[PDB]
Each structure stands twice: as structure tokens, then as C-alpha cells.
């Protein structure tokens, strides 16, 4: 009746997703924009439009909040006009021209040699990859080149009258004089991860007592999909119990998300201690560094 040491693995399943309460585009990937897998209600969308061909299509929107999406690629020209528009280009090498017009527009480039015209208002461009993947140059015409390698080739996108740029790593205030990008502090950052653990004592006399998470920022909320599992106190710790068949020799917790306040630490080590028991106890632990 000696508790045998189990095996535990923790895995960051993706990079942190910074979310901003004041920017509904935050946490929406280019892919989700191109597929329509986001909440159009958060943007007050009143009309939706697509392109038609695999070549340069011109789609004009309405004076209302329009969703216009390149479903067939080719490098389409989208005119948003008035209203707060969501203009989503495609991923062909040939550029989209996305003209936001008046209102506060979301201009989603996709891949390729895209031209993004914010127009009047406070406009946001959504670019793929991280800010660090992009070279900014000033143009003679007052616009900016955003150079990025896509498919091992250097591509140039041009941005005009865009106040904000959203990358995978967050939203930046864009200085339209000198092309400075200044990081905006997120409201929260979602860190997705998984825990898997198994007993080395395989006769059913042992169960997992608990999974103890440590090293987490105070005020962080752990989720399993929908469910709130717990809020991280002063001590940086959560004791997990009852999230598995209690009989099981092997535990896999998936769909876990740690939502960290933006004011909390941009770097920490998430440690898991898997505790095996029968009267006596034994532990193993693993860590992942979260950025
Ligand atoms: Ca044992
Ligand atoms: Ca098209
Ligand atoms: Ca397109
Ligand atoms: Ca419109
Ligand atoms: Ca507009
Ligand atoms: Ca594009
Ligand atoms: Ca605009
Ligand atoms: Ca603008
Ligand atoms: Ca045993």
C-alpha cells in the first residue's frame, strides 16, 4: 500500500490570445473572419455580401454596418461606405483593395499584396502572424508598407488612414506620421492548455486525489469550456478535484483556458502536481512557461 509516483504532462496548446473589451475584433483570427465564425452582432452587422469570381470583383456595401468577405479569393475590391464595416479579403497572392470609407471599420487583409484604406474614423487592420513578423516603411504617399514573408516570399501590404493594427500577439496603436506601433495593454489574455496524468499502479487500488496548479497570476480564472473551475488567489494556486471519472487510472483534461488579467504578469510558469493515492500519497509535476 505504497503510493507509486504517477506521470503528469502539462501542455500549452497554443499561444496566449489577448482580448480587449473595447475592440470586438480582438480574439478573431483572419480564418474565423473569412469563414464567418464570429459574432456579427458584436459589430452591429445589418447586411452581408460575398464576392463571386476568382478574379478582381468590386462589391459596394451600404450606408449601414456591412460584412463583405472574399469567399473565392482573387484580390477583390470592397467599398464599405458609411457605417462600421467588416471587410474581409482573401489569401490569394493578388491583393485585395479594402476601402473602409467613413465609420470605424475592421479591414482584414488575409495573405497577399493587399491595399487597406481605413478612410475617416478610427479603423483597425487585422494582419496574420505576430507584430514581430512585420517590417514597417514610410511611403512617399503618406501610407505605409507592411512587409511580411508569406510562403517563404516577401510580400508588401499598404495601409492608409489606419489607427490600429491587430496581430496574433495583440492590438497596437499606429502612429500615422512615423509608423511607430505601440502595444495596447489587453483586458485579459487567454492561455489554452491540457493536462494528462496516469497512475503507474494499474490494479485500481490507486486513484488521482487531485491536480494542484501553481505559479498562476492572482485574479486569473480557469475555465473548462463553459465551466468556471476557479479563480486564482494571492497564493497563485488552484486544487482541481472531480473533473474526471474518479475510478480512472488515466486523466486527460482538455478545453482548459487560463484567463489572466492584462494588468498581471506577461510571463509565468504554470506548474501541475498530479497526486496519486491509496492512504499514502505520491506526486509528480511538469511545468510550461506562458508568455
Ligand atoms: Ca501503490
Ligand atoms: Ca473574388
Ligand atoms: Ca480576395
Ligand atoms: Ca457600410
Ligand atoms: Ca465604413
Ligand atoms: Ca488578401
Ligand atoms: Ca473608416
Ligand atoms: Ca481612419
Ligand atoms: Ca496496487
Author numbering: 4168 to 4458
Direct quotes from the study:
Here, using this criterion and an AlphaFold3 model of a 5047-residue RTX adhesin from Aeromonas hydrophila, we identified three different ligand-binding domains in this fibrillar protein. In both of these bacteria, the adhesins are single polypeptide chains of the repeats-in-toxin (RTX) family that are exported through the Type I secretion system but anchored to the bacterial surface by a retention domain that folds internally and is then too large to pass through the channel of the T1SS. The crystal structures of the two novel domains were solved to 1.4 and 1.95 Å resolution, respectively, and demonstrate excellent agreement with their modeled structures.
Budding out from this second split domain is a 17-kDa putative ligand-binding domain (dark red), which AlphaFold3 suggests is an RTX-type beta-roll containing nonapeptide Ca2+-binding sequences. After these, another split domain begins (colored pink) that leads into a second putative ligand-binding domain (colored dark red) before returning to finish the split domain (pink). These two domains were expressed together, purified, and crystallized. The first section of the beta-roll domain is a short alpha-helix that runs parallel with, and leads into, a short beta-solenoid domain composed of tandem RTX nonapeptide repeats with a consensus sequence X-G-G-X-G-(N/D)-D-X-(L/I/F)-X that together bind nine Ca2+ ions on the inside of the solenoid. After four coils of the beta-roll, the domain ends in a short beta-sandwich motif before the polypeptide chain returns to complete the split domain (colored yellow to red). There is no obvious ligand-binding site on this domain, but based on observations of other split + ligand-binding domain combinations, its binding site is likely to be the most solvent-exposed surface. It bound to only one glycan slightly above background levels. It did not bind to any of the microorganisms tested, nor to the erythrocytes, but it did bind in patches to all three human endothelial cell types. AhLapRTX appears to be a novel ligand-binding domain, and there are as yet no indications of what macromolecules it might adhere to. When the crystal structures of the two putative ligand-binding domains (red and gold ribbon) are overlaid on their AlphaFold3 models (green ribbon) to compare their folds, the agreement between individual domains is extremely close, with RMSD values of below 0.5 Å.
